[PDB]
Amino acid sequence: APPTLWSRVTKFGSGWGFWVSPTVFITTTHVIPTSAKEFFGEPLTSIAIHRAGEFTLFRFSKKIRPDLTGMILEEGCPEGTVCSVLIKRDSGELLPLAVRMGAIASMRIQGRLVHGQSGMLLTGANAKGMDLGTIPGDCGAPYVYKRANDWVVCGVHAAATKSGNTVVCAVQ
Amino acid sequence: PPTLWSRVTKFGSGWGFWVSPTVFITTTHVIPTSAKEFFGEPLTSIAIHRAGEFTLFRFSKKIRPDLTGMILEEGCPEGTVCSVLIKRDSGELLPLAVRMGAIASMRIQGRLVHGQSGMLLTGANAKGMDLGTIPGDCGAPYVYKRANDWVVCGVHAAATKSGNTVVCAVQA
Ligand SMILES: O=C(CCc1ccccc1)Nc1ccc(O)cc1
Numbered sequence: 638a639p640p641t642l643w644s645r646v647t648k649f650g651s652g653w654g655f656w657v658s659p660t661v662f663i664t665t666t667h668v669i670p671t672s673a674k675e676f677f678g679e680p681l682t683s684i685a686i687h688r689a690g691e692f693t694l695f696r697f698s699k700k701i702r703p704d705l706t707g708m709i710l711e712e713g714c715p716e717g718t719v720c721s722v723l724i725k726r727d728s729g730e731l732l733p734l735a736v737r738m739g740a741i742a743s744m745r746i747q748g749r750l751v752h753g754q755s756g757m758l759l760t761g762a763n764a765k766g767m768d769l770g771t772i773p774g775d776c777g778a779p780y781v782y783k784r785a786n787d788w789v790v791c792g793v794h795a796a797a798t799k800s801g802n803t804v805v806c807a808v809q
Numbered sequence: 810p811p812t813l814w815s816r817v818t819k820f821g822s823g824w825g826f827w828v829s830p831t832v833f834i835t836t837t838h839v840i841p842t843s844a845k846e847f848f849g850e851p852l853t854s855i856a857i858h859r860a861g862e863f864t865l866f867r868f869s870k871k872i873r874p875d876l877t878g879m880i881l882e883e884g885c886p887e888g889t890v891c892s893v894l895i896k897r898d899s900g901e902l903l904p905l906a907v908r909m910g911a912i913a914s915m916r917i918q919g920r921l922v923h924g925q926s927g928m929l930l931t932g933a934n935a936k937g938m939d940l941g942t943i944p945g946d947c948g949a950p951y952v953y954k955r956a957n958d959w960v961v962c963g964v965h966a967a968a969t970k971s972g973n974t975v976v977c978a979v980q981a
């Protein structure tokens with residue numbers, strides 16, 4: 638995946654978030670620290686926060702990441718698109734996990750109710766574990782795919798099944 | 810915290826895999842043709858067992874005492890979904906699901922290669938995404954989980970232009 642998309646993946650609370658532009662940061666709702674009153678040197682009062690279940694978007698009053706260009710964020714992707722989940726793991730290892738996207742679903746994962754775009758990992762037959770699949774620490778990692786020359790981002794990692802074979806992408 | 814990924818090591822024109830502290834396996838054509846020592850050990854003290862495009866090195870001291878011994882078998886049953894553990898010079902880890910078929914002699918881009926046939930499950934073309942293999946990937950290992958155990962069953966030897974068909978070189 639291009640160096641420019643890996644530069645947008647930022648360690649955040651108990652998981653990750655993604656810079657769409659200089660002023661727009663998206664994450665997974667449950668990774669946000671519940672007491673936090675300041676983000677990147679800016680108070681709560683100076684930040685626009687749109688929340689839809691497990692998807693949260695922050696828009697700031699000034700350019701946090703002026704090194705960045707605005708890119709396309711969409712409400713999920715067509716059924717059968719293959720995406721990469723841009724996962725950072727221990728020691729500057731970068732894990733772009735291949736996933737085949739399916740339909741909008743509502744599910745129960747280990748007691749919690751989750752809603753988003755379901756997908757199946759293309760890494761192996763049994764994704765359970767950290768070598769071939771996801772860990773709770775990967776929440777907020779972005780779902781991206783290439784189309785006609787450009788790259789699109791279409792959600793953030795919300796959950797994975799007991800077996801690890803199914804993941805859920807929270808969408809706008 | 811143990812990891813399979815720690816066993817994948819840069820070697821000659823590609824990669825190799827540590828099966829145990831004393832046992833390293835790779836693709837025969839990536840091995841350097843001019844050499845006196847490999848991992849600090851003089852070739853003097855290295856057993857080399859070649860079977861076509863599969864080579865095994867057994868060292869006379871523990872090069873990786875941090876590792877336990879793993880199960881190595883001569884290929885896997887037909888229809889087993891394996892994972893090819895590709896490391897890139899970018900710092901990327903790319904585990905791709907492959908459906909293994911029959912032992913075969915294959916025309917792959919001009920040349921004849923003997924090993925276990927497989928088909929990538931990412932989709933007929935990777936068009937710019939991390940969904941297929943490149944020449945530099947040769948020597949990467951084929952693994953799958955079976956009960957409580959990882960099995961390694963050979964090394965990445967070749968792939969077709971379209972990238973659909975792959976050959977896993979096996980012990981024999
Ligand atoms: O669905 C899969 C592979 C699914 C699979 C994964 C693990 C074990 C068994 C099966 N590929 C696909 C990609 C692109 C397409 O267009 C169609 C299919």
